[PDB]
Amino acid sequence: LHHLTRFPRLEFIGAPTPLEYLPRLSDYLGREIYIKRDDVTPIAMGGNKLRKLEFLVADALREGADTLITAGAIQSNHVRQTAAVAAKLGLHCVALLENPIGTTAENYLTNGNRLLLDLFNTQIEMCDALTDPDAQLQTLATRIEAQGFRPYVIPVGGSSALGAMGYVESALEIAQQCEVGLSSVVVASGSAGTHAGLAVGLEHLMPDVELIGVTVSRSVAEQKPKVIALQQAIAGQLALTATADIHLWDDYFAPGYGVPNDAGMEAVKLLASLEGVLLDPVYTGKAMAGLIDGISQKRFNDDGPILFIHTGGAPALFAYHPHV
Amino acid sequence: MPLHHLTRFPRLEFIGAPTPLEYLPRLSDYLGREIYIKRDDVTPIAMGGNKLRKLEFLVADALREGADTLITAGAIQSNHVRQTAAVAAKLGLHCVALLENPIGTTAENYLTNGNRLLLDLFNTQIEMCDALTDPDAQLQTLATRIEAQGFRPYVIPVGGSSALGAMGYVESALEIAQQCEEVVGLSSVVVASGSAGTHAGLAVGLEHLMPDVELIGVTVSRSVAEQKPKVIALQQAIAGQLALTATADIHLWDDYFAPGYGVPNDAGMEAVKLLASLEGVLLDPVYTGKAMAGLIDGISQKRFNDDGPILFIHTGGAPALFAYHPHV
């Protein structure tokens, strides 16, 4: 795994993020539950996207870029973290945003992550839909370049093979921190970089552990090709083999990306009330709902300890309140 | 060596490792002065903040007493209440909160979003009152009612600001001294001064570890005349508990909080926008935005002892941004 040091990398996090036992949640579910606190990173309310940006933005600087361009929903955590990093480094930031849920709710449209974008002086470009994100970002990049800037394009969710190296890094922390008998790891699976990064790292570091991605936007059939593709791409770049099966549960995100559901919201309440831990309605709440039902349906490989990867997202709580 | 009596006070571990102390190169470039930041806003519990350091001592005391319930008070958008509630949930303690609306707003996000929203997630029992006219007395009346239900209550004062709670910031000063060692020779430290525990704890710690550093408290709710005896009372009580003397004068600037506690002002807003746009750092309209506006003006007016490096204590507060939006 030494090839990770060959990639340029900025230091946004520093020390490994905490890995904690959750004794009250464990007592309630009758199962040992641990949490990787990737929500606690120091930049602009934190999250998983920061691990990716350590690599992506290092690349951006290597190319001498002065502008970061990315895309996501109005309430995207990735756009928020990209914009914070841009501000920190004196780079301009252009965000291509969509309204994925057709809401006119004031807090969704203007509060939460979207509010922070304004504080970070993000240039906002609206679009009807992100039907072809890569191509749409490329078009915007040319226009911004025509204005006299030197743009660097960061893909949706920061999920490229390079971005996903942040989660190979996270896997190293996990492996060091777990040295008890961990059986399963649960993570939200969205743009797939987090899932795929963890997949490559955990195959080599903790081969006996089962990694489960809980989809937040797509069926198993649509999502599996995406995760596998990144997995193979990451593996090649690190000069590793990656043969582990990708596991995905798609039962926990209906009626679609960015729409809260009851199981998800109840998971948010459960973690807040038992552990003082804040999840979110779009990602971690749905992923935790998956973990809980996995216990209910005896869906994991065995009865042993489960590690939940907290990827962040809590600023969305304030955007989604009171509804829509 | 000098702060060794801190050992005798029981404490829970909520923070873990020392919080980051960071240079702010873009802010420093703009202000023409070396600016560092102590990131007490980045702690692991429910969006972080200064109040957590106090809770390490207060809640340890509660557990030693056999208490199963935490009672405290503050504004609807109190960070202290939010952090207290989060710790209570984590430890399986009941939490009861006496809340007031200090600004008389009817704005829906102030009333129900931000910190207030999180209170419901932590299952806090919420008690409204017209105003916290006598917080200590009102807390005791509530404690009596709660005790009558069979609960074993532990009353935490507004802001967590008792001599015991303030030990959290004596501890913070130890981190600061260690982090600055052979790295930076600080001239000044700036912190928001509210219920006064943070200011007072830092005052005691810094007098002993870094006596030549100038500690500036920027008031968020009171004039220098009203605030200073509160800080001094705590400073002296903290020193006593540690078998130390504290002879340092307390310094406060009160020019930066008008028109009052919990009301945003223009300079505060501009300080929030400055830190966000230059450093990707999130301040808040009630506390840190106002303290930072003080730091900035202090530089502009040459209010500090000299032209040397300034450390800003980031005490947190950012969830209030979502409560104050779009207006109050």
Residue numbers in the entry:
A (entry chain B): 3 to 181, 184 to 328
B (entry chain A): 1 to 328
Authors' description from the paper:
D-cysteine (D-Cys) moieties are found in firefly luciferin, semisynthetic cephalosporin MT141 and malformin A. D-cysteine desulfhydrase (DCyD) is suggested to take part in the catabolic degradation of D-Cys and D-Cys-containing toxic compounds. The polypeptide fold of StDCyD is similar to those of other fold type II PLP-dependent enzymes and consists of a small domain (residues 48–161) and a large domain (residues 1–47 and 162–328). As in other PLP-dependent fold type II enzymes, the active site is situated in a large crevice between the two domains.
D-Ser, although analogous to D-Cys, is a poor substrate. Hence, the structures of StDCyD cocrystallized with D- and L-Ser were determined. In these structures, electron density was observed near the active site into which the respective ligand could be fitted. However, the internal aldimine was not disrupted. Presence of non-covalently attached D- and L-Ser at the active site of the structures of these complexes suggests that the formation of external aldimine might be the slowest step in the catalytic reaction for these two substrates. Comparison of these two liganded forms reveals that the enantiomers are oriented with their Cα protons pointing in nearly opposite directions. The proton at the Cα of D-Ser is oriented towards the hydroxyl of Tyr287. Therefore, it is reasonable to suggest that the catalytic reaction with D-Ser is initiated by the abstraction of the Cα proton by Tyr287. D- and L-Ser bind non-covalently at the active of StDCyD without forming external aldimines.
